């Protein structure tokens, strides 16, 4: 699990946008937002 660029910005967005960030950045999918940035699977 790692952090994506806009994932922190699209974290508070809807549901399809949250999974779209990780999937669009070559990541497994949306996992959770901790500390000060969103983290993908």
UniProtKB/Swiss-Prot annotation:
Cite the record's tissue specificity text. Answer: Highly expressed in the fat body.
Q: Which one GO biological process term can you cite for this protein?
A: antifungal humoral response
**One GO cellular component term:** extracellular region
Task: Determine the domain of life of the protein's source.
Answer: Eukaryota
Q: Coiled-coil region(s) at which residues?
A: none
Q: List localization entries.
A: Secreted
Task: Write out the GO MF terms.
Answer: calcium channel inhibitor activity; toxin activity
**What sections of the protein cross the membrane?**
none
Q: Taking the first listed entry, what is the main subcellular location of this protein, grouped into a coarse class?
A: secreted
Name which cysteines form disulfide bonds. 7-21, 11-33, 22-40
| Keywords recorded for this protein, A-Z | Antimicrobial, Calcium channel impairing toxin, Disulfide bond, Fungicide, Ion channel impairing toxin, Secreted, Signal, Toxin, Voltage-gated calcium channel impairing toxin
Is Protein biosynthesis among this UniProt entry's keywords? Answer: no
Report the function annotation for this chain.
Answer: Has antifungal activity against T.rubrum. Blocks voltage-dependent N-type calcium channels (Cav2.2 / CACNA1B).
Family of the protein in this entry: Belongs to the diapausin family.
Report what the protein is called. Diapause-specific peptide
Which organism encodes this protein?
A: Gastrophysa atrocyanea (Leaf beetle)
């Amino acid at each position: 699990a790692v952090r994506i660029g806009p994932c922190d910005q699209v974290c508070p967005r809807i549901v399809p946008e949250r999974h779209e960030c990780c999937r669009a950045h070559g990541r497994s999918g949306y996992a959770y937002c901790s500390g000060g940035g969103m983290y993908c699977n």
